[PDB]
Every structure is written in C-alpha cells, then in structure tokens.
Amino acid sequence: HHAADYVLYKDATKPVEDRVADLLGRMTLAEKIGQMTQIERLVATPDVLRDNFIGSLLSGGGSVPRKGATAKEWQDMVDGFQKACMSTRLGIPMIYGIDAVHGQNNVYGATIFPHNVGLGATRDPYLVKRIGEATALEVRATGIQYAFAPCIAVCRDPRWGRCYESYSEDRRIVQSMTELIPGLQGDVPKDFTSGMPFVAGKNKVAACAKHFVGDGGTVDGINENNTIINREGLMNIHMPAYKNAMDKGVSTVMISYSSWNGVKMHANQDLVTGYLKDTLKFKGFVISDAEGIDRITTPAGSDYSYSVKASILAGLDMIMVPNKYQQFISILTGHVNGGVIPMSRIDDAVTRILRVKFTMGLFENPYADPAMAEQLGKQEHRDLAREAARKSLVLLKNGKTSTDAPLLPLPKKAPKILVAGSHADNLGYQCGGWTIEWQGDTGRTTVGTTILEAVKAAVDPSTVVVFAENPDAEFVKSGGFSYAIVAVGEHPYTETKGDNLNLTIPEPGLSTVQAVCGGVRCATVLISGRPVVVQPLLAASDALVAAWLPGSEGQGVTDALFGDFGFTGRLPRTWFKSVDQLPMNVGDAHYDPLFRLGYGLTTNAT
Ligand SMILES: CO[C@@H]1O[C@H](CS[C@@H]2O[C@H](CO)[C@@H](O)[C@H](O)[C@H]2O)[C@@H](O)[C@H](O)[C@H]1O
C-alpha cells in the first residue's frame, strides 16, 4: 500500500495478525530473543537496549528515576529508553511495565487507592472498574504503558504476606473484581473472542492477571511455597478468575513463584501451555516473575541453563530477567543454536509479544503524551479513592452492650476530642506495602490526608482536636474529651516480609487502645492487610472499624465515622478466633469464625 519504501508492519491500517507475521518474518534470532527479554531500568542504557534488541523494561518496587520525580521526569525517562529501542534496525518499540496495583503507587503524588482486600469488602465491581480507569490515566501520566495488575490470587490463609493483594478468600468475589481489567485496558468490543489481548489505545494500559496459578493456596500461607490441592480444587478455587480475565481480554499473564503439588509454576508446561494457552485459548503473552526462572532450581540460580530451557519449553514468552540479561540472551541463543529449544517456540513467544504491542497501539504511539502528566494525583481520582476507602470499611462493633447508645456516627461538634495511636497520623502506614517503596514506608511519603488531617477537615470549627500518639491513661482521663478516635494496626509489608504466623499487631497498639478507651468513649480504627487477633482490641473498644489499607485519602475513614455516609462494607475474608484454626475458609467443615465472611454492621448517614 503505496510508497516504494513501504513496510507492511509499519502500516497502521493493516490487521494486527498481518503486521505481526510481516514483522516476525523479517527478524533475526537476536531480534527475536531481544523481544523476549525484559530488563530493569536500573541496568538499561541506550546502547544496551539497542545492541540487545530489548523488548521490554520494568520498574520493580521502588525503582524510580529519583525520589520525588515529577510525571514529566518519568515521561522523559521512558521516552529516553524508547528512543533507543526505536533506533534499532526494525524500530520495535519497547513496552514499559510497573506495579500499579493500588494506583500508580511507585510515583510521588499519585493517588493511592485502597488495597485489594478492602476493595473486596465493597462488593462493588463498578467501583473497581472506575479505579482501573483512573489508574490507567495516572500510569499513562508517567509515560508507562503496562501495569502488573490485577493480582487475582485467592488468598486461602491470611498468614500470607500478600493476603492484602487478594480481593477475597472467595473466588466468586475475586471473579467479580476482574472488572479492574476493562477499567485498565478499556472495554472489549461486542464480538470479542475470549483469550485475545485487548487495549483500547494510548489512554489505556496493558494489564496482567497474576500470579498464575494458586499463589494464594500455599502451605501455611508461606510466600512462593507449595500449593497442595487436587486438580478439582485448583480449578474450583484458584483458576476461575483467569477465565474471567480471558473473557475481558487481559493482555498478559504473569507466572507465580509458587509450586503446585511440587511442580514449579515457571516449569509447568501442562498448566502454562496445556491449560492457559491451549484450553483457555490465551493469545496474549505470558511473562515470568522477576528471577522466577532462576527459582525453578534449589538453590535458586544454581543451573541457569536449565532454568532457561525449562521455562521457555513450559511456554513462557517474556522473561522478567530482570538484571542479568547478557547471560539470559547468551544461554537462550545457545539452546536454539543447539536445537534444544525449537524455532517454533521462539516464534510463538515473539508472535504473542508483538500481538500485544500492535493491538495496544504501541507502534502508533510509542512515546509519552505530555498533556497526560496532569492526570497524576488528579482530584477527581482522589475523590474516587475516598469513595472506595469509605466503602471498604467494615464496622465490627458499635457499642459494648446491645443497650448502649451507638457510638458511631460521631458528632462533628464537641468541645474537645482526642485523636490517638500510631496509625492516626502516618500516611505510609495507612497505605501499606507497594507505596513509594516496595515494602512501603513510614510517615509522609507522598501526597495525601492522614486520619488526623481528615478529622481536622471534618469537624466543626468550635471542636478542639488534640493529637497524642501514645497517651497514658491519666492524660486521657484528665483531658476533658468528648470521645476519642484511636488508630492502630500493622506496619507496611510486602511479599515474604509479610508472612506472619502470629498475626498480632505490634505494640504499642493494644496498650494505647486500652489507655484511651479506659478514659473516654472510643472508636478504634484498625489498619491491617488482613484479619489479625482482635478480641483484646474489641473488648476495650466502644466501636471498632476494620479499615484495611485505605490509601492516601484518609477522609474516606472520617466520611463514615462522622455519618456523612453509612457503613456498608462486608468482610471479604473470614475473621478467625485464633491462628491455630488456620487455614479456615467459608464453606469448610469445622467453620468456627469470630466473624464470618460477609459480616458487617451498618449505620445510616446523619
Ligand atoms: C527483593 O527484590 C525485589 O522484589 C520485588 C518483588 S518480586 C516481583 O516483582 C514483580 C515486578 O515488580 C511484581 O509484579 C511481582 O508481583 C513480584 O512478586 C521487585 O519488585 C523488586 O524490583 C526487587 O528489587
């Protein structure tokens, strides 16, 4: 179609499959293996990207151009890498990925949404879709085209450090929340074939259903461990939301570090090729987790030659190396040259990668849109996060006896009130893991409103608000307070650091609640990624709210405390009486919860 130097794959009017096949046919082995290689920005340079024909870059947790970087700085970084990739012989644009898992959370000033467990409490898939939409905008504000979300793990044991990344222990709730996908990517057309990838265009991002499969089913909630369950159970609990993801055109699937009945997912041909590709008809690309192929072996990295063979033969398409790319490319090249990995396998991997790139418009818009920068931290998105935080809250108790006046909602006008606890004025703590840093952090790490700040913004001007992080009993009794709001809970964590066999909150937390509630009527706000031992907190408190990890918009909490809205959240997980009961999930034989899945008290708006 019509100039003399015409190249079909560069023609935006041509069908995606025609463009894919036209480009594939022109590629060298080096160019093909390059496409299959994803590297950290930390090891990327223009020469590296060009010389190795690199297909993808990522920012892992906390991998940022600098602390406090603006949206424009991110765009300029991504564009710099893209300019190198576009300078190769074939000019294949790279795709840049990041964990935008509760907003564009590595980025300073990005709206931080509640983590997934709290989103499960909302039972509101349309809310989650709108969060996906807002997240896509804030990711594109930074020039990034690809989000490693949603985590559709079904966490079956809250001792797991990623339980907060799971919408629920109930697969039906996880299935419902796959609405994140068309939020991130755009809605698929009416004709759409389940398993095809889809992204609407330059204001949307490629999504990633992760981590395939059974990441939430590991023994004792040990992160990356073995999931011991028969096929029927894997298919009934851990797999269903992957089919919903196929139906919604999820562009990519990331493989789990975990094993199923002793077989590493990163080496499981039956599940990756036999099931995901051949049965579910997935036609996007399958990506490893970071050093996932290394961890096939024990010790990890002890036979990288085998790691490459096993993973690529299993059906993985793109390898999140993410650092030692030279070794990866060299070994894979050697395996192909020696006939150990057939060219058909390479061509399939590259077909899938290119399919996603062409489909999403990446060849047409390889560079960032500077007009999108202002989407970052946009007030409308914060208003959405505030709605989500409020809807996520689960009221567990509202009065010590059935005959007491209900404490909540609290009055906005009172002479003097107390706000207390380690989590009352700590933005990092209310965001939890995957916020600015990989593991999260403490204090004022980004733009947001803490619980204290939200209280001050809510109350009548005549209301005096006193803050004390850890007041003693005498301070509270002598203070002339009308009531107190006390916020305590878990510190930020991610992945194995969050694995926890005792699930008791750090001190001081309970001691502060006891001191405050002993002196004045108190509403306890519990910040956690999961159910934790809660009977002692309940015994002390007039009212208690499970607020999960509500994100940057602390006014979501006070919107419910002061009755602007009624409490509506319902537990998306079983609340255990004791960790000795675990695992214990709804539908089990000996089900003996402190609070069952679905429990939640309500209030009416005042
Ligand atoms: C300890 O090394 C750090 O690990 C984290 C998490 S591993 C892996 O990372 C993927 C890409 O960021 C996530 O999509 C996936 O869910 C995680 O399991 C990694 O983010 C850091 O880059 C790395 O320093």
Side-chain angles (χ1 to χ4, degrees):
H1 294 239
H2 286 162
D5 69 332
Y6 175 82
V7 167
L8 192 151
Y9 75 87
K10 291 183 179 168
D11 182 348
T13 71
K14 289 282 163 170
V16 167
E17 295 305 310
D18 294 343
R19 294 178 79 186
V20 174
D22 184 73
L23 176 52
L24 185 67
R26 301 169 190 265
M27 293 171 76
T28 69
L29 178 60
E31 284 164 342
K32 288 179 186 177
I33 291 170
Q35 282 304 296
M36 298 171 67
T37 309
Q38 181 184 75
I39 72 177
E40 247 282 349
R41 55 157 289 276
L42 286 164
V43 301
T45 70
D47 283 348
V48 166
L49 294 170
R50 194 184 296 115
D51 295 346
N52 299 281
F53 307 104
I54 296 299
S56 185
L57 283 88
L58 83 154
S59 278
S63 183
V64 305
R66 69 190 188 134
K67 242 87 199 323
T70 67
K72 175 173 156 36
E73 284 178 69
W74 281 91
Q75 290 199 186
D76 291 342
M77 177 192 72
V78 175
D79 282 346
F81 295 139
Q82 191 68 289
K83 178 161 184 188
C85 292
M86 293 303 292
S87 77
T88 62
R89 182 180 83 96
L90 295 173
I92 305 173
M94 67 81 211
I95 188 177
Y96 195 109
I98 199 166
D99 296 283
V101 296
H102 63 146
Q104 174 53 148
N105 51 71
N106 288 118
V107 175
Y108 185 85
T111 308
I112 305 299
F113 295 91
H115 275 297
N116 285 176
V117 60
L119 297 183
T122 74
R123 303 297 202 283
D124 193 339
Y126 185 54
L127 169 75
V128 173
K129 188 182 182 179
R130 298 144 58 209
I131 291 172
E133 300 170 352
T135 300
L137 295 173
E138 300 207 15
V139 176
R140 285 285 193 163
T142 65
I144 294 173
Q145 316 95 341
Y146 177 26
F148 300 130
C151 181
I152 57 167
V154 184
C155 171
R156 301 293 284 175
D157 193 321
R159 293 173 292 181
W160 192 35
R162 317 195 75 158
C163 208
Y164 69 81
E165 302 198 64
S166 174
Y167 302 105
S168 183
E169 76 195 37
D170 185 346
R171 57 94 192 177
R172 299 173 196 76
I173 294 169
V174 175
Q175 283 181 106
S176 75
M177 304 304 184
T178 60
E179 282 301 279
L180 191 82
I181 293 166
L184 286 167
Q185 300 193 321
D187 289 311
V188 301
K190 64 154 287 305
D191 56 74
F192 196 73
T193 303
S194 178
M196 288 292 287
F198 182 81
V199 180
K202 69 187 189 160
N203 304 124
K204 296 295 192 183
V205 298
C208 181
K210 72 184 194 184
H211 311 83
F212 182 87
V213 57
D215 47 342
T218 62
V219 177
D220 294 344
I222 297 167
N223 186 221
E224 309 189 12
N225 208 259
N226 198 15
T227 294
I228 303 162
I229 193 168
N230 65 14
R231 196 171 218 263
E232 185 169 328
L234 189 81
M235 297 299 179
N236 192 59
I237 295 169
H238 293 107
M239 190 66 75
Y242 284 93
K243 175 65 164 60
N244 297 82
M246 299 298 99
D247 289 352
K248 297 173 187 184
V250 76
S251 290
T252 75
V253 173
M254 183 185 301
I255 305 305
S256 190
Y257 294 130
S258 59
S259 299
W260 178 46
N261 295 325
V263 177
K264 291 277 177 178
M265 284 302 318
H266 281 255
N268 198 321
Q269 192 183 261
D270 287 349
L271 285 183
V272 176
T273 297
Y275 199 75
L276 175 62
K277 293 180 174 190
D278 293 351
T279 306
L280 297 183
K281 309 301 186 180
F282 181 55
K283 301 297 187 199
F285 74 79
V286 179
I287 187 170
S288 83
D289 207 348
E291 301 169 14
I293 76 174
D294 310 48
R295 297 165 112 197
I296 288 161
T297 67
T298 298
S302 68
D303 192 349
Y304 200 70
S305 184
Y306 178 74
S307 289
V308 173
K309 184 177 99 172
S311 66
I312 296 306
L313 291 178
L316 280 71
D317 305 311
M318 184 180 288
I319 301 306
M320 183 181 300
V321 182
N323 302 311
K324 304 194 216 80
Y325 56 86
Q326 177 185 307
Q327 166 185 67
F328 172 72
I329 297 167
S330 183
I331 289 171
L332 182 48
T333 297
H335 281 150
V336 173
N337 286 340
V340 171
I341 295 167
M343 191 60 26
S344 62
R345 187 62 273 287
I346 302 301
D347 286 352
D348 175 64
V350 176
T351 291
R352 291 163 170 280
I353 294 165
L354 295 182
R355 179 178 295 125
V356 170
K357 292 182 169 188
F358 282 116
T359 294
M360 71 191 289
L362 190 64
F363 284 74
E364 279 60 77
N365 287 276
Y367 298 107
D369 183 358
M372 294 290 282
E374 57 200 280
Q375 295 288 339
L376 193 69
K378 230 187 153 201
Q379 193 55 43
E380 292 90 336
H381 306 346
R382 295 189 187 274
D383 292 344
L384 174 65
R386 177 174 174 178
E387 172 188 353
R390 176 253 300 178
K391 286 174 169 185
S392 75
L393 306 177
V394 182
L395 185 59
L396 295 180
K397 186 180 178 168
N398 193 197
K400 298 202 179 160
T401 79
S402 59
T403 57
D404 285 9
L407 180 59
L408 303 179
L410 297 165
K412 294 177 176 177
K413 189 170 170 177
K416 192 173 175 192
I417 68 168
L418 176 61
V419 176
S422 58
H423 290 55
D425 191 39
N426 190 321
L427 187 63
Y429 281 11
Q430 75 185 49
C431 291
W434 289 113
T435 314
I436 304 297
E437 304 289 357
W438 173 43
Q439 291 288 323
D441 204 356
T442 184
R444 181 144 250 92
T445 57
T446 190
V447 175
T449 302
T450 63
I451 294 171
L452 174 63
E453 289 166 346
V455 171
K456 292 177 177 186
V459 294
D460 192 83
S462 73
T463 302
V464 175
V465 181
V466 177
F467 174 65
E469 189 173 339
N470 192 204
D472 68 16
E474 179 186 342
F475 176 96
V476 182
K477 280 214 297 307
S478 292
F481 300 114
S482 292
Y483 55 83
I485 295 162
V486 53
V488 300
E490 299 194 295
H491 296 171
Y493 58 80
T494 308
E495 285 168 82
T496 304
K497 282 274 173 175
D499 285 0
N500 187 328
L501 298 179
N502 65 75
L503 298 182
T504 64
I505 64 164
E507 289 307 292
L510 178 62
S511 64
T512 295
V513 168
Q514 290 171 332
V516 172
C517 302
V520 71
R521 60 205 195 106
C522 70
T524 296
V525 175
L526 177 59
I527 299 284
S528 70
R530 51 182 160 202
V532 292
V533 173
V534 78
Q535 298 95 324
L537 290 166
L538 287 168
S541 303
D542 300 89
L544 190 143
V545 175
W548 315 106
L549 299 173
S552 57
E553 307 311 315
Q555 291 168 105
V557 174
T558 50
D559 285 348
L561 293 177
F562 293 109
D564 290 339
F565 299 85
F567 284 91
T568 54
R570 292 189 291 282
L571 287 186
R573 302 203 58 77
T574 297
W575 210 296
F576 55 81
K577 296 180 172 177
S578 155
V579 300
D580 299 343
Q581 302 177 296
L582 297 179
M584 186 179 67
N585 295 285
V586 73
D588 280 2
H590 279 265
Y591 193 62
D592 185 27
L594 186 66
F595 300 106
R596 76 196 169 275
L597 188 146
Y599 176 89
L601 302 179
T602 62
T603 56
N604 294 332
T606 42

